[PDB]
Amino acid sequence: IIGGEFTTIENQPWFAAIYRRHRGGSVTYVCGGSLISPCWVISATHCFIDYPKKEDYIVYLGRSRLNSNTQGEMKFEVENLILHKDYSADTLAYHNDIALLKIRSKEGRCAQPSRTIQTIALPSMYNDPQFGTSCEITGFGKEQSTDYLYPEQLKMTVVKLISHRECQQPHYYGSEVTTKMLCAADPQWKTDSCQGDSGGPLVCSLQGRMTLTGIVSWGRGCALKDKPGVYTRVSHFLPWIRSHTK
Numbered sequence: 001i002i003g004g005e006f007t008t009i010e011n012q013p014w015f016a017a018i019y020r021r022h023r024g025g026s027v028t029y030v031c032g033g034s035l036i037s038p039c040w041v042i043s044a045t046h047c048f049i050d051y052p053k054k055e056d057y058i059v060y061l062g063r064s065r066l067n068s069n070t071q072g073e074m075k076f077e078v079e080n081l082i083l084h085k086d087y088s089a090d091t092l093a094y095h096n097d098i099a100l101l102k103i104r105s106k107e108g109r110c111a112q113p114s115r116t117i118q119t120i121a122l123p124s125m126y127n128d129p130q131f132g133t134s135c136e137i138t139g140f141g142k143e144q145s146t147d148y149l150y151p152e153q154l155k156m157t158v159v160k161l162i163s164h165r166e167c168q169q170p171h172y173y174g175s176e177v178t179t180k181m182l183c184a185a186d187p188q189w190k191t192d193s194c195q196g197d198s199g200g201p202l203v204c205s206l207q208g209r210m211t212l213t214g215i216v217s218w219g220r221g222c223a224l225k226d227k228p229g230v231y232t233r234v235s236h237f238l239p240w241i242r243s244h245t246k
């Protein structure tokens, strides 16, 4: 997250931190995710497209910090890693950038809701908020496009949904953004998602509900003028999601 503020998991209790354990026994952070039901975390396919063995992944819930344990966090194995069959990557964009991780504790359980863990609601299909709506993003991604390291403390910020019309202009992303995507940015370009935030939630109040409206997918650079963040548009994917979750 570029700009924005530090926060704790209690302010975004659906956020899931996904890591990969290495043969060296080293474990490195991969991407964010969102708990949409007790046994399911939703994230972005591009995060795991290169290494698809479920075995080498670990999901934490209730976690406020990148490389130290947060009191009340839970650790999970990945029982099923479901990557979208129609995923592809273009020059900038990713398509169908959506994945499901069915989580199981080594003791066989799914998530137990707490002060630090809650599911987030999905939207009704094709139901999104209007352009100009303020939504929240959260992650452990870079604080500067140019950083080597990720921050140790969880961050979040606020961005406004952009119109597709606005996003499809040539100076923005032109032809590479599609209707299966959503664009969100700061009006002044101050704050944004970045590398390491992928898979993480874009949350909006829809109806009277905090709803998961997007998944962090891509952008050029981070916090660049006329280069907004692009997110998987969740409302388009209810059939896919329900297929696996039933």
Ligand SMILES: NC(N)=NC(=O)c1nc(Cl)c(N2CCCCCC2)nc1N
Pocket: 145, 192, 193, 194, 195, 196, 197, 198, 216, 217, 218, 219, 220, 221, 222, 223, 224, 227, 228, 229, 230
């Ligand atoms: N929102 C804005 N402006 N950018 C981003 O969200 C964003 N930016 C980058 Cl650099 C990024 N990378 C870099 C390699 C390509 C994709 C995976 C990791 N992923 C993102 N999701």
